Amino acid sequence: KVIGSIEFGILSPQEIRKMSAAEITVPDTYDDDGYPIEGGLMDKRLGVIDPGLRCETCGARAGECPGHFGHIELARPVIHVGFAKTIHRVLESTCRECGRIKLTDEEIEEYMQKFEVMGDRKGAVDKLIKEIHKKAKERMVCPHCGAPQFPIKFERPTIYWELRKDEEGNEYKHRMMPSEVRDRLEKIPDKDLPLLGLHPEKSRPEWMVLTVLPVPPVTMRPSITLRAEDDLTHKLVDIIRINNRLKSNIEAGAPQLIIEDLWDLLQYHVTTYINNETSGVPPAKHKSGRPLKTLAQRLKGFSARTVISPDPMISINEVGVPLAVAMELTVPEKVTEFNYEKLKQRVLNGPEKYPGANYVIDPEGRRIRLMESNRELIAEKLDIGWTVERHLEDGDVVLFNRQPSLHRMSIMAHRVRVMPYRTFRLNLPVCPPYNADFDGDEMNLHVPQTEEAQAEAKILMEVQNHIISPRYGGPLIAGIQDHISGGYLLTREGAYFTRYEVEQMLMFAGMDVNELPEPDKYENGEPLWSGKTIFSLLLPDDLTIWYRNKLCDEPERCEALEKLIRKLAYDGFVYIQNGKLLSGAVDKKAYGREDGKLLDIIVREYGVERARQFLDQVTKLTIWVITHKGFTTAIDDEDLPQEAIDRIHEIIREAEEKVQRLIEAYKRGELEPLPGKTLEETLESKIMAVLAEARDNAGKVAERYLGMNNHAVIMAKTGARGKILNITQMAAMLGQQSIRGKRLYRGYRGRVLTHFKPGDLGARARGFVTNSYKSGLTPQEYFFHAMGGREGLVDTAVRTAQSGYMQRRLINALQDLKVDYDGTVRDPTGIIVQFKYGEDGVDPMKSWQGKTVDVDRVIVRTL
Amino acid sequence: THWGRICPTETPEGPNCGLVKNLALMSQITTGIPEREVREYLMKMGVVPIEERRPAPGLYRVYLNGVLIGTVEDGRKLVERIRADRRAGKISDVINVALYED
Amino acid sequence: FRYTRFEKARIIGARALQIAMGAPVLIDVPEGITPLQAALLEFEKGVIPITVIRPS
Amino acid sequence: EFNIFDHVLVPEHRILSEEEKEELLKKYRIRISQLPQIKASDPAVVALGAKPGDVIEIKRKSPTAGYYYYYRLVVE
Numbered sequence A: 001k002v003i004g005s006i007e008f009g010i011l012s013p014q015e016i017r018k019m020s021a022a023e024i025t026v027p028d029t030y031d032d033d034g035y036p037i038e039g040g041l042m043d044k045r046l047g048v049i050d051p052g053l054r055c056e057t058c059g060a061r062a063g064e065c066p067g068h069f070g071h072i073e074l075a076r077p078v079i080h081v082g083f084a085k086t087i088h089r090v091l092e093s094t095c096r097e098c099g100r101i102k103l104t105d106e107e108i109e110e111y112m113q114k115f116e117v118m119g120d121r122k123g124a125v126d127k128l129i130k131e132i133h134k135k136a137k138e139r140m141v142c143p144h145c146g147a148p149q150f151p152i153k154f155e156r157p158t159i160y161w162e163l164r165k166d167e168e169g170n171e172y173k174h175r176m177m178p179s180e181v182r183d184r185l186e187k188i189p190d191k192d193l194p195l196l197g198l199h200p201e202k203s204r205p206e207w208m209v210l211t212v213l214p215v216p217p218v219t220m221r222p223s224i225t226l227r228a229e230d231d232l233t234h235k236l237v238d239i240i241r242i243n244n245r246l247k248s249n250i251e252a253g254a255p256q257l258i259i260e261d262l263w264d265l266l267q268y269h270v271t272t273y274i275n276n277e278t279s280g281v282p283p284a285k286h287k288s289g290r291p292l293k294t295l296a297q298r299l300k301g302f303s304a305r306t307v308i309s310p311d312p313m314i315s316i317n318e319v320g321v322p323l324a325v326a327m328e329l330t331v332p333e334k335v336t337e338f339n340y341e342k343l344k345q346r347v348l349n350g351p352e353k354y355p356g357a358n359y360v361i362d363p364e365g366r367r368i369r370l371m372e373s374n375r376e377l378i379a380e381k382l383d384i385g386w387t388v389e390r391h392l393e394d395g396d397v398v399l400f401n402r403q404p405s406l407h408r409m410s411i412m413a414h415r416v417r418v419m420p421y422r423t424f425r426l427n428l429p430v431c432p433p434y435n436a437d438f439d440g441d442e443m444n445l446h447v448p449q450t451e452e453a454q455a456e457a458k459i460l461m462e463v464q465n466h467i468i469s470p471r472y473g474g475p476l477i478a479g480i481q482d483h484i485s486g487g488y489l490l491t492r493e494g495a496y497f498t499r500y501e502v503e504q505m506l507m508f509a510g511m512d513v514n515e516l517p518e519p520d521k522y523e524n525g526e527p528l529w530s531g532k533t534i535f536s537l538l539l540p541d542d543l544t545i546w547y548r549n550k551l552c553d554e555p556e557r558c559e560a561l562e563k564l565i566r567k568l569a570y571d572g573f574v575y576i577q578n579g580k581l582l583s584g585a586v587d588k589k590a591y592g593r594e595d596g597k598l599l600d601i602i603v604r605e606y607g608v609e610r611a612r613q614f615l616d617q618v619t620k621l622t623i624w625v626i627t628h629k630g631f632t633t634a635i636d637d638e639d640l641p642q643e644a645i646d647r648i649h650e651i652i653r654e655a656e657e658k659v660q661r662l663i664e665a666y667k668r669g670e671l672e673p674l675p676g677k678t679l680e681e682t683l684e685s686k687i688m689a690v691l692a693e694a695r696d697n698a699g700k701v702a703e704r705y706l707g708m709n710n711h712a713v714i715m716a717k718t719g720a721r722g723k724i725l726n727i728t729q730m731a732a733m734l735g736q737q738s739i740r741g742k743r744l745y746r747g748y749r750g751r752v753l754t755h756f757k758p759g760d761l762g763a764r765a766r767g768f769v770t771n772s773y774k775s776g777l778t779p780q781e782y783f784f785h786a787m788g789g790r791e792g793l794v795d796t797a798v799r800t801a802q803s804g805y806m807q808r809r810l811i812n813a814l815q816d817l818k819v820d821y822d823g824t825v826r827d828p829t830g831i832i833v834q835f836k837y838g839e840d841g842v843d844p845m846k847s848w849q850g851k852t853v854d855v856d857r858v859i860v861r862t863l
Numbered sequence B: 001t002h003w004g005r006i007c008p009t010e011t012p013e014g015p016n017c018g019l020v021k022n023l024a025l026m027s028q029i030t031t032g033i034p035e036r037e038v039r040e041y042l043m044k045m046g047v048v049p050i051e052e053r054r055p056a057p058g059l060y061r062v063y064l065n066g067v068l069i070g071t072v073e074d075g076r077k078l079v080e081r082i083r084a085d086r087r088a089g090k091i092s093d094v095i096n097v098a099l100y101e102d
Numbered sequence C: 001f002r003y004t005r006f007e008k009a010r011i012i013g014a015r016a017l018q019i020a021m022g023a024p025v026l027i028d029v030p031e032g033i034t035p036l037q038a039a040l041l042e043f044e045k046g047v048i049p050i051t052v053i054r055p056s
Numbered sequence D: 001e002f003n004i005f006d007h008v009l010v011p012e013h014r015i016l017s018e019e020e021k022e023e024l025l026k027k028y029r030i031r032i033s034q035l036p037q038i039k040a041s042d043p044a045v046v047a048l049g050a051k052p053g054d055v056i057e058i059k060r061k062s063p064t065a066g067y068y069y070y071y072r073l074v075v076e
Ligand SMILES: [Mg+2]
Pocket: A435, A436, A437, A438
């Protein structure tokens, strides 16, 4: 009862005459300002549009009433403009008198057999189509008409010719009539059409010459009230206007020429009806100059939104929905034996309370509005089979959306948890997939209705089912910033939590009763809890994993592994054993997105219920540690003593004179040019590298004279928004300010700013800040930084154009591709684009960082 | 050239970024000055009208709003003269004279 | 030996829809929720009679 | 002066006999016209001497599945 296929073709006169409701003969419209009903083009058993129901037997009032087609018996045949070039390509490729494709038996036999090998590719079938055309177009001796010399054709816009013979060496051009052409196409047998671009059953050539013109229904020609008549109707009026004149002149006297003039005129009018923007055809305009837009101009030319707020106290798959939004958005629930009581209490609570309802739909289908009247007599013998539109309940399937919708991860299924106030609450680890922050970002909320839709979203789009990103073999939903810092503090060498802290705060997670909390590792200094052990209270009793932490570098790289070929004296190489955290500290390496080593493992091995649990309980774990201990950045965190200051000062002076020596050398034409680049570019390139070298060195100096064990540094080295590239900019120096590559030059005719000497190519002159954000920028530097800062604005905002467009292109190219059940990626036209997807057939969302089953890992699993 | 004319930070976000900007605190816009008193004082100080000139290389070429009125004798002489004239309050402050050097 | 995600979702939806339009549910007695969760619990017990005919 | 042949980015091209052809087209349940295709103008085809009707069996090293065999029809 749904659409398998659609098979296009060309309408036969018979069809148009049979599918017609009445023969249109009177060239007129409505008329006028009162009583709009005639007997030709308007509702003469054809279609309804005014508030009056009368129609073609089907009655069917103006409301809901599919339009009926009509027809026009053309007094003479008329070439269809859309087929003109095709009709031409057909005429001079086939034989008149004959009906053959002017090809030898051999040619047909091997051509058709070369035509079946291409029977699906629309692009590659035209090459052979035109090739065939030209091969027949050159011959004049067809194998099915004793050959009678074929007068080549001419064309356009809708006229045909044939340079025949009658004299001798002459080449007069016999004119071509639609009747002649059509009756000449009617000879071409069904056997030859396949060798062309036509069908014996779907698209006969003779039908390309219209003998009957199908009239669009009333519903497709609506009148645009102020009435602004429909264009189609007007042009049609002209067409019938000439058609009737023609037929009336044929029935009477026949001076031939008269009939020819009128025939060609009719031809013009139909040509315009098909396409007003045609070539060689004067656009039929309305009395204003404004061109009529016909057919070729016709087919051409439950949610919510609000601000978002964080909530690490709700489940990762849950969504906070303001109860007001919950009272507007409703769900269709058919009353059955299990919710009979609930729904009755809901509808009785009315549109008020909190668990109420707004509408009710009885089995007949009539919607009942619970506002007016009262929830009393309305909520009676409901019986099973009705339908209540109840307000959003805690747990309902709901789609959360944030635009722009880059990857699929932008729309995820959530579980409504109705809460007051007026914002959407999003659990914090689900921020990376949405790419949302908070400053002012707003998101969309969708409420699906049909049970199939809700289920489908709940089974396939639920948050927990998409912790890992399909782009790369790793988790997308994880720790963000505090989760990282909290994981570090919780898993530190000196992590000793008094009973008060452990006991009271484990309630942010769960899991204790008996052999979980036990037993207090340290009673040395005092009876206390080691953080490693408290963290250990979550991981299952069989995951043994080991991977170097972020600090496993520099001369602190080391190693000292030891395989099994128990004490504890390790730190870097994080070692977790059956839930027990032996060594290591939690950071960007341990948790967080992008990574690919722990959160990854617990989702492959134990994917749905466990993964969400480990995620959910960890945030609240890590958060309370951070909160109860105190975590801040002060202003002294970036301060360096006088010693580092004097050192940096001497460094920037050195770099300055390095640049001057380069300039003084350039002035005297002391050559020394770089190999590839131009001389002027050599100077610039050498300076930029010289200054960049000095910049990194200044930053290297900065990381020494600053305590590496205070809060700020932890964040840099840990895994909560960090980058040595920015640290150098905050304390040491920002560096060279550039504009689309080259240095800052665009200014006055002789310099950048009016504070330097004309031609000064010095360090400070061509835009180089020496001071960082701490020490403060000078008037010049502040301006230079602004000139260089405009880059990020323009660049980042411009990239969107190419990203969006490029993606939109490749999306509109691959959107059809699926994995067939035989494990094969095939285009929608049955073309094996890839025997077994991705060569191996392993979904990138389910592979171990590209590897088709991480073999080294599976083997180790032997305990 | 925006230094002291356009705000380096005041820029609306979006496609309007860079196109539309704001006037600096330290910035005035020219009022109106009829070319009469201008021309008159100009010639009167040594500008040699075009109705005569060759000029090139008259070692000079003077312009008024793109209109080459004429030439004088020494360049720095004219620029310093008109400038100091303006500083003495003898001529309107809205008159600017620039000596391009090439 | 198992189902694919899409097949699971499809089946669940189908059963839930069957339950909505009437059609007694297999072993469930003490519950108190929508047809969806009914089909969901029914699936957790592997009693959903809906079979996926795979083209092979 | 040597040759191309299984070199830089060139996989093991082979020609199919009627047997493996029919069987292969039977396995994937597809017609002759549904395969990716090569041209007779393709250098790797003229080197191996392929005719407009052959189905080249291509063996390439894949950094994911290791060894993969593709198939294509020689055309123009
Ligand atoms: Mg953000």
